[model samples]
Target chain A: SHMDTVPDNHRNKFKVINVDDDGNELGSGIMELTDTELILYTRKRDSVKWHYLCLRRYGYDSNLFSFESGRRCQTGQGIFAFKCARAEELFNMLQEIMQNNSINVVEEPVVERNN
Target chain B: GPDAVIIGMTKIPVIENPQYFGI
Candidate 1:
């Protein structure tokens, strides 16, 4: 009885992937986004999480989006992304969640300034 | 609906995107 193809505002979760600069998917799994945290689970059996308060930045071009966080994985950086179909939905949810939590998603220019 | 959830790994780096996780 549902067909929006997007996660609702309530602790939404969806499929996502880790994409590299070359535009390739590096990891695949489900990603859960809540008011307080973002959790990543790779099909490779790896996992990590970052609190929204700890998230540093977010990047989204078209439907592919990424983020930088204060948390770190064994791989070193606390960054990740999603190239899935509903990333558009994730985009809006990202705004809503962060805004509610007194946070802001980065504009392309801000992320550029990071470099 | 997307019923197929086939998760996997990638030998390439999981940079997420080129803006930051890029070369």
Candidate 2:
């Protein structure tokens, strides 16, 4: 849940450019327009494919990655992802992109039940 | 049919091309 709400100072917008397997950009018109929106265009056929995705917000009860000290909210500075498909996959992508020695897993604030 | 977009965690060079997460 914490991950969904970015720090007030942090930017929520993200973007990716579309390119071919060789690394060369495919279209001149609009392969990538905005920071978070990817526009794929087929030059020869003059076709367009747009993909949109946004960093989702999590509820206070949801899980989040925290700093070692579990102090303040942790920022996913080194995490990045591609695709706007599902929530689970998005979380998995974040897990995979974490920086070495900087990854910390914290369960969302959940009340523990004790007898 | 289907469309995809990707973001890079690593600071890739200009010539390195862009990478996407295939969901």
Candidate 3:
């Protein structure tokens, strides 16, 4: 129920994430909000179609990692990609802080699995 | 014969916008 921030025990689940590699999971936790569409953000990436029409589109512009399926993103996994070179840098920096001080992480439910 | 008007519409799906996702 209270699945928003990262808890103490689960905090260890996160790992060192890389943004430049493209489609790398940065950080994933439970969703604190309610009835929200699940979205995992990705960087420097694009979607393809049968004709390369690009049915789905996402970039760095949408602040905060986002996903459509609402699947709880696994840390070190790609979230979204954008033109903002600084966004990547900023996110990386933020992740650095998380890696260092995950003790303060929040607990929420982004995606619930067989538990 | 019953005449009926069918209107085609596109709904811009809205994502509730997660406050946080496994962060």
TM-score for each model:
0.57, 0.21, 0.21
Candidate 2 per-residue C-alpha lDDT over A59-109 given as tens digits, one digit per residue, 9 for 90 to 100:
010111111111121121212222222223222323223211122133323
lDDT of 1 by residue, A8-64 (tens): 433377676656543457676555776555666666756556556555555455446
* Chain B TM-score, candidates in order: 0.17, 0.15, 0.17
* Poorly placed runs, candidate 1 (over 4 Å): A1-11, A74-79, A102-115, B1-23
Ordered list by lDDT, greatest first: 1, 3, 2
Worst 10 residues of 2 chain A by lDDT: A58-67
Judging by TM-score against the true structure, name the best candidate: 1
The best candidate in terms of lDDT: 1
Listed in order, the DockQ scores are: 0.06, 0.06, 0.02
What is the TM-score (0 to 1) of candidate 2?
0.21
| Model 3: DockQ vs. true structure | 0.02
Clashes of 3: 44
Error of 2 at B7 (Å): 12
Evaluation by lDDT, superior candidate among 1 and 2: 1
Residue runs of model 3 more than 4 Å from their true location after superposition: A1-78, A103-115, B1-23
Off by over 4 Å in 2: A1-18, A25-29, A32-37, A54-115, B1-23
Per-residue lDDT over A2-106 for candidate 3, one digit per residue giving the tens place of the 0 to 100 score? 764545323312222223223333332322111122122322321110100111222222222222222323331222222222333333333333234322223
